[PDB]
Design an enzyme around this catalytic site. Structure first.
Site, PDB file in Angstrom:
ATOM      1  N   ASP A  40       0.835  -1.205   0.000  1.00  0.00           N
ATOM      2  CA  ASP A  40       0.000   0.000   0.000  1.00  0.00           C
ATOM      3  C   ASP A  40       0.872   1.259   0.000  1.00  0.00           C
ATOM      4  OD1 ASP A  40      -2.302   1.798   0.664  1.00  0.00           O
ATOM      5  OD2 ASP A  40      -3.351  -0.093   0.987  1.00  0.00           O
ATOM      6  N   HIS A 104      -3.765   6.153   3.035  1.00  0.00           N
ATOM      7  CA  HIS A 104      -4.500   4.960   2.638  1.00  0.00           C
ATOM      8  C   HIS A 104      -3.937   3.692   3.298  1.00  0.00           C
ATOM      9  CE1 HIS A 104      -5.802   1.919  -0.395  1.00  0.00           C
ATOM     10  NE2 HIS A 104      -6.813   2.743  -0.593  1.00  0.00           N
ATOM     11  N   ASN A 206     -13.208   0.253  -7.809  1.00  0.00           N
ATOM     12  CA  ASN A 206     -14.202   1.267  -7.398  1.00  0.00           C
ATOM     13  C   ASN A 206     -14.754   2.116  -8.543  1.00  0.00           C
ATOM     14  OD1 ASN A 206     -13.475   0.629  -4.516  1.00  0.00           O
ATOM     15  ND2 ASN A 206     -11.547   1.556  -5.199  1.00  0.00           N
ATOM     16  N   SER A 276     -11.175  -0.832  -1.038  1.00  0.00           N
ATOM     17  CA  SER A 276      -9.918  -0.794  -0.262  1.00  0.00           C
ATOM     18  C   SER A 276     -10.139  -1.017   1.227  1.00  0.00           C
ATOM     19  CB  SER A 276      -9.183   0.526  -0.437  1.00  0.00           C
ATOM     20  OG  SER A 276      -8.484   0.534  -1.654  1.00  0.00           O
TER      21      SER A 276
END
Ligand SMILES: [Ca+2]
Ligand SMILES: [Ca+2]
Ligand SMILES: [Ca+2]
Length: 340
Positions: A40, A104, A206, A276
């Site tokens: 990530d 994130h 998404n 996520s």
């Protein structure tokens, strides 16, 4: 059970369409001695993460992405992926002009294993587990080859120039992806990670599009996760279709971030939405399942772990508008399954 100040807000751990992580903690399973890698944006030095974060690595090769002054290095610190002036670029679309740092990787990491029962902040799904931050994403995202090296290393694969991973992961969380078919190289690294024994858990994406049109979902040997809401229906933005294996809460997910808009400034908490956010719920439950499997001397292959997770889901709110796997991930049914 957890004493954390804002646990009550994490409906997604305990409510009707939550992952039932509370019912598993009631059994004394928290993902103890399980290691989950997070591929990530890196990791914050956050009072509600530090205790549960292990040595990781920074796989970002371009220093204009990493914003730390060099390519691959041993410090997976999230410098902040903010940008302005259409640096990513897409000029002149005003919606692509600028973005504040996402934090994130930390939001995702907190869902898996935010420090729990330390009073401050929030809880994690597998709070007895530990997180290895594999930093592959910075300003404008990341390179496929950084992501693939990172995921292989996460599993215990050796890469030239990178010190051997002392903390190989049983579960590799990839809250990331883009448009296009799985690359030869990415498939290869996923297969090698899977052969090492790691379950690779990935986001459907998404774009309100068929997830088959995206990677890592279109790869073999991944577990693809769609997003549901507090109402048990498909979250509006979640990718969908036959290659989504299951779903998890991916709207109004409270976890650990920083208040900084550019570089870190002070520890904070925020609600986010996305496949996520759903993905680390499944990574967290995978870890709970493994700690239950350990307690009865039962090893599980990535394929077997994936089957337990997919076959023990709780039902959606009615049918959905699009296919989103078998149900919502259910830690109680998953754990009860492996304990007989
Ligand atoms: Ca670097
Ligand atoms: Ca670094
Ligand atoms: Ca906490």
């Amino acid at each position: 059970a957890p004493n954390d100040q804002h646990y009550r807000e994490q409906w997604h751990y305990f409510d009707r369409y939550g992952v039932k992580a509370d019912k598993v903690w009631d059994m004394g399973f928290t993902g103890q001695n399980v290691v989950v890698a997070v591929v990530d944006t890196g990791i914050l030095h956050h009072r509600d993460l530090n205790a549960n974060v292990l040595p990781g690595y920074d796989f970002i090769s371009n220093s204009q992405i990493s914003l730390d002054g060099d390519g691959r290095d041993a410090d997976p610190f999230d410098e902040g992926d903010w940008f302005d002036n259409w640096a990513c670029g897409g000029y002149p679309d005003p919606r692509k002009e600028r973005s504040d740092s996402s934090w994130h990787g930390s939001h995702v990491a907190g869902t898996i294993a935010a420090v729990t029962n330390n009073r401050i902040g929030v809880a994690g799904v597998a709070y007895g587990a530990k997180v290895v931050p594999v930093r592959a994403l910075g300003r404008c995202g990341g390179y496929d080859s950084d992501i693939s090296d990172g995921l292989y290393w996460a599993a215990g694969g050796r890469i030239a120039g990178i010190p051997e991973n002392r903390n190989p992961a049983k579960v590799i969380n990839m809250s990331l992806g883009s448009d296009g078919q799985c690359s030869y190289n990415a498939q290869t690294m996923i297969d090698r990670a899977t052969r090492l024994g790691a379950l690779v858990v990935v986001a459907a994406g998404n774009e309100n599009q068929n997830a088959s049109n995206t990677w890592p979902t279109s790869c073999n040997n991944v577990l693809s996760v769609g997003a549901t809401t507090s109402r048990g229906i498909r979250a509006s933005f979640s990718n969908y279709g036959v290659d989504v294996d299951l779903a998890a809460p991916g709207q109004d997910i409270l976890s650990t971030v920083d208040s900084g808009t550019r570089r870190p400034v002070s520890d904070a908490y925020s609600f986010m939405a996305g496949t996520s956010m759903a993905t680390p719920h499944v990574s967290g439950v995978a870890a709970l399942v493994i700690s239950a499997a350990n307690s009865v001397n039962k090893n599980l292959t990535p394929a077997e772990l994936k089957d337990v997770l997919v076959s023990t889901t709780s039902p959606f709110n009615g049918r959905l508008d699009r296919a989103l796997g078998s149900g919502i991930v259910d830690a109680e049914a998953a754990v009860n399954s492996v304990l007989g």
